[PDB]
Amino acid sequence: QLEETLSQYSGTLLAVSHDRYFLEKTTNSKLVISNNGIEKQLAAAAAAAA
């Protein structure tokens, strides 16, 4: 139910979750922390779209 209602939540959420299936209801943009700081992703953003 927290997976459900946080989708109907009215924005400004910073959802750290080590799950892969919880964030499928609570994600529009991602912050992938990686080597040498953040990576502000808005999609998968892998393999450097060409």
Binding site: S10, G11, T12, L13, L14, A15, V16, S17, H18, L23, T26, T27, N28, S29, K30, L31, V32, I33, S34, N36, G37, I38, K40
Partner: protein
């Protein structure tokens, strides 16, 4: 959060990581193991070597949830803990919210 840098002695996590998020959006923060996920929110929300600039809205009411359970006023009753003003503030606000 502009030009942020976070280091622990020689353990360096953040370096010049410029991102800016406004209201009304779902921000998922993913770290495989130790990406500072828990560390960023502390250095979003606090001082202590957020090297750079972290600006946040002064009139926003940030409700915070921790990973670690070590922020309880221990040995208190949830009666005294939860702010229950008059009559249905125990029931219609609170005790229904607990049992339900």
């Amino acid at each position: 959060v502009q030009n942020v840098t976070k280091a622990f002695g020689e353990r360096t996590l953040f370096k010049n990581a410029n991102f800016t998020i406004q209201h009304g959006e779902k921000v998922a923060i993913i770290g495989p193991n130790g990406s500072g996920k828990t560390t960023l929110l502390n250095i979003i929300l606090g001082q202590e070597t957020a090297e750079g600039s972290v600006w946040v809205s002064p009139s926003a009411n940030i409700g915070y949830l921790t990973q670690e359970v070590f922020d309880l006023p221990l040995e208190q009753t949830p009666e005294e803990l939860f702010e229950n003003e008059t009559f249905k503030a125990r029931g219609h606000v609170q005790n229904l919210m607990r049992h339900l």
